[PDB]
Amino acid sequence: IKQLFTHTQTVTSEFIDHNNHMHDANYNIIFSDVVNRFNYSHGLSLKERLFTLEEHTTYLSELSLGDVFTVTLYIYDYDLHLFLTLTKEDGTLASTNEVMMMGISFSTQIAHYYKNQPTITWPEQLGHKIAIP
C-alpha cells in the first residue's frame, strides 16, 4: 500500500482579484498551508516543534471560480526537499511547487513516508531554470 498526503479544496472568492483566475501568490499561500499540514502530522506539531529556505512555483493551468483542486505532496530528497503538485478534477496538472526547508524522530516519519510514497516520473518543472527561450 503506497500513500500520498493530500489536501483538496475549492477556489473561493477570496482567492480571485482580477479577470476570474486564482491570484498567483494565493497558490503559494495554499502550498505553504499544505506543507505545514504535512509537518504538523509528521512529528513537528506547533505543540511539538522548520524554516522555508527556498521555493519554485510554476503556473500551468488557470483556476476559475468554484474549481475544486487537489494538492499532493511528494518527498523528492532529504537530509528537506519537497515537490507538490496542484491538479484539477480532470487530473490536469495545474501548478507545481518545489520547496526546501531546514531546522532551527521526524526523520522517521519522513523516511517511512518517502519509503511508502509511489514512484512517479518527475515532470520537467522540477529544477527548471527560469529563462526566455
Q: Which is nearer to a second copy, 1 or 30 (CB)?
A: 30
Cell matching residue 1 = 500500500
Residue 106, class by beta-carbon neighbours within 10 Å (0-12 exposed, 13-18 middle, 19+ buried)?
middle
Q: How far is the CB of 115 from ligand COA (least distance, A)?
A: 23
- Confirm or reject binding of residue 65 to ligand COA (CB under 6 A): no
Whether the Cβ atoms of residue 2 and residue 117 lie closer than 8 Å to each other: yes
- Confirm or reject binding of residue 54 to ligand COA (CB under 6 A): yes
Window of 2-10, 20-28, 65-73, 105-113 that interacts with a second copy by CB under 8 A: 20-28
Site for ligand COA in 1-40 (CB under 6 A): 21-22, 24
CA distance 95 to 111: 26
Place of cell 527561450: 133
In 3-state terms, what secondary structure has residue 112?
A: helix
Question: Out of 12, 52, 107, 116, which residue is the one contacting ligand COA (CB under 6 A)?
Answer: 52
CA distance 46 to 79: 21
Site residues for a second copy per CB under 8 A: 18-19, 21, 23-25, 28-29, 31-33, 46, 51-59, 62, 77-81, 98-100, 104, 127-132
